[PDB]
Write a protein that binds this ligand. Sequence first.
Ligand SMILES: O=c1ccn([C@@H]2O[C@H](COP(=O)(O)OP(=O)(O)O[C@H]3OC[C@@H](O)[C@H](O)[C@H]3O)[C@@H](O)[C@H]2O)c(=O)[nH]1
Ligand SMILES: O=c1ccn([C@@H]2O[C@H](COP(=O)(O)OP(=O)(O)O[C@H]3OC[C@@H](O)[C@H](O)[C@H]3O)[C@@H](O)[C@H]2O)c(=O)[nH]1
Ligand SMILES: O=c1ccn([C@@H]2O[C@H](COP(=O)(O)OP(=O)(O)O)[C@@H](O)[C@H]2O)c(=O)[nH]1
Ligand SMILES: O=P(O)(O)OC[C@H]1O[C@H](O)[C@H](O)[C@@H](O)[C@@H]1O
Lengths: 206, 309, 638
Amino acid sequence: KEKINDFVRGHFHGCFDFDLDNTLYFFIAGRYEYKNKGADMFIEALARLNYRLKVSGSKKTVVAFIVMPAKNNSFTVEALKGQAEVRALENTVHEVTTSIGKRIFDHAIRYPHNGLTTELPTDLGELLKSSDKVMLKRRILALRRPEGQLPPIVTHNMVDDANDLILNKIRQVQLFNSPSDRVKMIFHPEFLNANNPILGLDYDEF
Amino acid sequence: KEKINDFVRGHFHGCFDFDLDNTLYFFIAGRYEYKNKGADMFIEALARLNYRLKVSGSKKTVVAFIVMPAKNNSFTVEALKGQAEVRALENTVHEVTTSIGKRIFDHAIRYPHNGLTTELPTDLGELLKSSDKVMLKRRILALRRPEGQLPPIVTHNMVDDANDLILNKIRQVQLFNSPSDRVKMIFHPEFLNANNPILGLDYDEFVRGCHLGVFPSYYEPWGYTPAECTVMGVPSITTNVSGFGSYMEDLIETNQAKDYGIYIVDRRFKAPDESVEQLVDYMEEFVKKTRRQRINQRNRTERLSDLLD
Amino acid sequence: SRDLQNHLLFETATEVANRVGGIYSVLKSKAPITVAQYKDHYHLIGPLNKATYQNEVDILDWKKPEAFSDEMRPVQHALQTMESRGVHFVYGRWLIEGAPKVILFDLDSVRGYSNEWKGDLWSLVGIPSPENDFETNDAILLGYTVAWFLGEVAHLDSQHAIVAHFHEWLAGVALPLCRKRRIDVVTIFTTHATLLGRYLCASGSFDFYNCLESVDVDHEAGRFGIYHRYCIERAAAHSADVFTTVSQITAFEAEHLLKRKPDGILPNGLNVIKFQAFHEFQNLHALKKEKINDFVRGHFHGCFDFDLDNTLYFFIAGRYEYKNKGADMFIEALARLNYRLKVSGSKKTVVAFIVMPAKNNSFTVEALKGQAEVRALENTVHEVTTSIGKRIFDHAIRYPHNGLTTELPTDLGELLKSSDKVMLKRRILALRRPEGQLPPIVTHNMVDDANDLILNKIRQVQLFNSPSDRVKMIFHPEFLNANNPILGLDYDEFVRGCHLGVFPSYYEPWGYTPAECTVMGVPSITTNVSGFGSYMEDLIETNQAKDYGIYIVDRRFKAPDESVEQLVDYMEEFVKKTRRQRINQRNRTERLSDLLDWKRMGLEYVKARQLALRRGYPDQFRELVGEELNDSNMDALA
Ligand SMILES: O=c1ccn([C@@H]2O[C@H](COP(=O)(O)OP(=O)(O)O[C@H]3OC[C@@H](O)[C@H](O)[C@H]3O)[C@@H](O)[C@H]2O)c(=O)[nH]1
Ligand SMILES: O=c1ccn([C@@H]2O[C@H](COP(=O)(O)OP(=O)(O)O[C@H]3OC[C@@H](O)[C@H](O)[C@H]3O)[C@@H](O)[C@H]2O)c(=O)[nH]1
Ligand SMILES: O=c1ccn([C@@H]2O[C@H](COP(=O)(O)OP(=O)(O)O)[C@@H](O)[C@H]2O)c(=O)[nH]1
Ligand SMILES: O=P(O)(O)OC[C@H]1O[C@H](O)[C@H](O)[C@@H](O)[C@@H]1O
């Protein structure tokens, strides 16, 4: 689940307004048979669940995955780029905490000498410097997305987007991952595999 | 030097009141020959250097190492315990920063939603929770040493502590590692080796880490100690009665030799007390150096390498 | 009557709180050394940018008696006199190192007088001024407003000499006004290019450095629709007591196109930030280079058959000006270098970067994918090595018991298990490229790929990153930025990671690029028609210059084919160097950086301001020095 979360943060970069500790992950998977496998019921029912959760004031969130192979030209630029930006934020955070660590350590080992009246740091300015702030802010800016852009409903570039049954149904029921939607749609038109660059999981692990 | 820093933090646990970024590391090394190798002049000059630095209001700290093997019963429980206590604080700090990291990250990734109005956290309490504060406080308490107890002048239990020359000399000059002393003394009565549990360095590594070797020998036909030291780009003090000292005194004009990090104390044509004062003038001169000037000197020292090959 | 040692400085430009071009960087980086000399006697003057001045200017009140000293009172009363007519302005500190005082004039508050001043300017100096040209209109409004102000300061300050320095034709209109009105202020004009220069080199077909001396300036300025602008630049050049350019090469073109031999050179310095330890720049180079390496492994995934420990990084960077920045020579020369390195049987590899912005639709799927696949291998290796460690450790802690005859494991099978292998093999399969596909020559999807000059030239010379090519090409058609997902470096970081800048410019009055590259301790190729190259040419004997990392191509006195060959010679000369030779060369290059610092270059601004005082007040200058010093040049004087 922590690997799915890592994917989900990337996918919702700039539009990340729910708690993953209060998020559930539904999925349908299999061979692309829109009728026989019930992708039509699945998507309809999700749209109806979305309504029910908004009406009922639920604070929970459902990210629903559809994993059915369709004809595609691989991952989108957006997918990869969002995964990279989150990864850059992680590394910049890891740098900053290594520095915070050295400053916490110094305070701790030095107490109670050189005017250190408290056992631990009390003011964040002792630990977080200008330099640290600047680069964390730049990482946040990179995650920002254009005014009014929403998280996509599909991770790949489709060969025939306009005629795809799954995507036509998701458009028809209007599940566009808006902030007020309690149910989110992610179509991943390909079998899962740990070699994937965005959701690096074998099917059984997912 | 950072490895020396790690040891020093342990050795001074609970009495750590100086900046290691403004701390210099002097050392004498060799075999236990109190007179011949000049341990007596070293300890004496350091005691006077301490006085000069307190009088001049110097913000520098010198930590003096003595590395000479004596008969011992291995490391003190205190020396080993202190090291384990610092190591335990480091691991707790690392646990805590991992948590802080997840909190910064969450904030950064979520901004500006869910009422996160600033790009970053502004209040420490968002990042540092009470459970973190508790385990840090326990590690700090464990580093605490009893009221009045000072950092030791020695790292090992000595066989016949009372009659040891180095220790009696340290006691006599009263360099007990007080907070007010700008010179600190650490006697390590064993040869250095990487398998050492408290100072896990080979001798060559430890020498590289220091700032100044101090080898005021009376009888030293050669003196491999300042030569090794010089080959590693570490400035050294020696004497004009040592082979190395006279051999270098010959090769460089004696006042220029300072600029190459070869300090030569006159033990031939001066009374012992004029010599001690000279050794102290050198130590004081070196302490007054900035970092940039230390870096330039070490370069010049290192340039001599070839001449000792 | 008037003091020449204690004197005022008014430095006027379009860009003073206001990022437009490179002049902003010059005046900003120069402020520290200027403020150190003048303190509260110095003022920068410019037009107020109402939209953006809030973020740069510390707005300071000018009415209080604590704003100015007793001797600097006249400037207060002069600003008051401007306020007496309703000329609205902003006094303040420019929020930059040095904290210099600025006077920003709101142009909207004199736009009524447009028609009067345009007419005055027409009959005085002959300068026409179309209404659709919004920038000359503003240049005119600025010039009259500033000459007015300097006229009032001259009236009210009878202690100090006044020096008025102007940068670029846009801030030049005040100069003919100061001359004709005979205002008691000595004037300097610095041009950072010429209008006819830029425009005559725009097509990339005109033989500029040879046909320059035979151009009918009025004719060409009419041909390019810039006659009115040309006259402003020309009037500013002629009216100024001292006339300056930023380089010897630009002084050549200035003399024939502006019809006045400049009185000397004002090359652009930097504010070089030193490191405590001289060698730290070497450390940084290795850290930044490791990030370039990381990018390259991804870029060449599946086709990685060379040693990065024996690879060099060349780059060009700048505005996309194919011909004027010599991206054409660069690519041509590299295709020739590639041939020489194959013939000689060198195992080395050059990876050449082109960093020049072109219209694009961001990174390619491929670029991002290979970076992620390499990253996935890294993580899988890290898991495996963690396992390996558990197995080594157990053996180490357990020896010599339970039949362990050797201190360490000896068979790889003891450490690397079936599941470890399967993982690693799968990561390797993800890095596999399709049969025949070569690493690309560009990292982005281009808006007009088929018609791009850079890509067409790479395709023409056929540098397609095949295994047998010793030179690789990577076009990165966007400015570098640490936020970039594939090469997360800022420009300065990337430059430090590289081995050689290559900037074979044709039109380049200064050459900020090779100067900045020099300051990072990275050697570079420039040209003798670049202002940086012409400056280094005269400062160092050109065979010694190579030992300092400054290679200088002759594009003035050689045919283009001879220039290309020389460019190949230098590139090749550099590849031959060992690591130890590269390190010593960078040390030499870094040592040379002190010369590009404003502490040294700002003396030339002093020499220009001296000459202005010596020329405007010769009788007083003679008697405040030992004797009559010569005034034909800045050099001749000092
Ligand atoms: O921790 C340490 C400290 C020092 N050393 C080594 O100890 C050596 C210095 O030892 P000593 O003090 O015995 O001085 P020296 O060995 O140079 O000569 C002295 O003792 C031996 C005799 O050959 C000489 O006549 C005498 O002057 C150096 O080679 C140094 O590398 C270690 O191996 N580990
Ligand atoms: O990725 C990059 C590449 C380059 N740069 C910056 O862009 C500059 C290079 O572009 P510029 O065109 O501004 O500088 P150039 O040396 O190419 O000068 C050119 O343009 C400005 C004019 O004043 C000069 O006369 C002209 O020759 C460098 O100084 C560098 O700091 C980046 O910030 N990021
Ligand atoms: O990303 C995926 C998704 C599904 N499957 C497998 O595909 C098989 C066949 O799916 P299908 O819907 O065709 O099942 P069937 O119609 O046979 O019930 C299942 O056993 C799944 O384990 C897979 O290997 N990777
Ligand atoms: O990138 P190169 O020219 O091979 O330089 C490589 C060298 O760079 C710096 O000097 C580093 O300090 C050296 O450790 C490194 O070996």
